[PDB]
Amino acid sequence: TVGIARKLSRDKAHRDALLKNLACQLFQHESIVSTHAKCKEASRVAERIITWTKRAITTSNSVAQAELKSQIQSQLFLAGDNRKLMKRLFSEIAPRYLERPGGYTRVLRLEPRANDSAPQSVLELVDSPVMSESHTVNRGNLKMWLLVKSVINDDANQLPHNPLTLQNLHKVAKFKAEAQLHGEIMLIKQVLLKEMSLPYDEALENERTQALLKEVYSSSSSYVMVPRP
C-alpha cells in the first residue's frame, strides 16, 4: 500500500481509471506523450496486459485462458474508440511480442514542458509496424524513425556510424527478420529524406541500408589481472 506504485496525487479509484485510460490510449495510438511519472506507471499496466494476452494465446489450460481473458477485460475500458480493443490486443498487438521476454514498451524522456516544468515522456509500443498493408505510414515506433534519421545524417556528413547507434540498430533487429527490417528502413528513408529535402537516389540508398544491416548482423588496459603469489 506504500511503495508498491506511484500515487500520482489521485485517490485510488481515480488513479486506476487514469492508468486504464493511458493503457487504452497506448494500444490505440502506438505511441503517446504524457508526464514522466504517469508514463512509467502506464507502462507497467500495459506490459502486464500484453503478457496476460500472450499467456491466454499460448496456454493449453482452458480455465487458465478464460481467467486471463477475464483479467484483460477488467483492465481495459471497452467503449467508443476502444470497442474492438480486445480483438486488436489478441489479433494485432500481442502476436508481435510472442518471442520477446518482457519489455514491450519504451518510455523515452523529452525536454520538460515549458508552462509547467513537468518532466515529459513518450510511452510507446516496441516494434510497432511502420507500414500497414495499405500504401501509407503508421503512427508509432518513434525510436526507429529517430535511428534512421541519425543514419541519414551520418550518410550526409560522410561520417562513420556511432557505436551507440549501431547498438540500438542491433537491439531493434533482435526480434526482426532482416529483409523486413531493411524494407522498413527503406520506407522510412523515403519519407525522411523528402521531409529534410535531400535527394533520393534509390539504388544507392538500398546499398547503404544493406551495408548498415551487414555490420549489425555479423558479429566480430590500465590494470592487469594477475593471480595471487
Partner 1 sequence: AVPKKKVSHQKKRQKLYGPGKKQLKMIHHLNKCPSCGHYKRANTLCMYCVGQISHIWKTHTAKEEIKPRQEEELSELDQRVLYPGRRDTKYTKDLKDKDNYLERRVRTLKKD
Measured at the alpha carbon of residue 67, what is the angle toward residues 62 and 68, in degrees to the nearest 5?
95
From the list 37, 57, 122, 187, which residue makes contact with partner 1 (rule: CB under 8 A)? Answer: 122
Rounded least distance, CB 115 to RNA, Å = 3
- When the beta carbons of 87 and 214 are compared against RNA, the nearer one is 87
From the list 139, 167, 190, 214, which residue makes contact with partner 1 (rule: CB under 8 A)? Answer: 139
- Partner from partner 1, RNA, Mg ion, none contacting 206, C-beta within 5 to 8 A by type: none
Residues in the chain: 229
Sequence-ordered alpha helix ranges (H) in the chain: 12-28, 36-58, 62-74, 85-88, 142-157, 163-173, 178-196, 202-217
From the list 1, 62, 136, 222, which residue makes contact with partner 1 (rule: CB under 8 A)? Answer: 136
CA distance linking residue 129 with residue 161, whole number of Å: 24
- Partner from partner 1, Mg ion, RNA, none contacting 7, C-beta within 5 to 8 A by type: RNA
With CB under 5 A as the contact rule, which of the stretches 13-21, 43-51, 110-118, 204-212 interacts with Mg ion?
13-21
- When the beta carbons of 31 and 209 are compared against Mg ion, the nearer one is 31
Cα distances (Å, whole numbers) of residue 28 to 43, 46, 220:
14, 12, 40
Cβ-based neighbours of 160, under 8 Å, separated by 6 or more? 154
Q: Using CB under 8 A as the criterion, what x/- string covers residues 189-208 for binding partner 1?
A: --xx--x-------------
CA distance linking residue 174 with residue 38, whole number of Å: 29
- When the beta carbons of 19 and 130 are compared against partner 1, the nearer one is 130
DSSP character for 223? S
- When the beta carbons of 8 and 131 are compared against RNA, the nearer one is 8
CA distance linking residue 126 with residue 169, whole number of Å: 13
Burial environment of residue 119 by CB neighbours within 10 A (0 to 12, 13 to 18, 19 or more) = middle
With CB under 5 A as the contact rule, which of the stretches 11-19, 50-58, 209-217, 218-226 interacts with Mg ion?
11-19
- When the beta carbons of 146 and 213 are compared against partner 1, the nearer one is 146
Q: Is residue 111 a contact residue for partner 1 (CB under 8 A)?
A: yes
- When the beta carbons of 42 and 188 are compared against partner 1, the nearer one is 188
| Cβ contact 95:129 at 8 Å | no
| Cβ contact 122:31 at 8 Å | yes
Judging by DSSP bridges, how do beta strands 31-35 and 120-125 pair with one another? antiparallel
From the list 150, 173, 183, 213, which residue makes contact with partner 1 (rule: CB under 8 A)? Answer: 150
Residues that bind partner 1 (CB under 8 A): 108-111, 114, 122, 136-139, 142, 145-146, 149-150, 153-154, 157, 162, 164-165, 191-192, 195
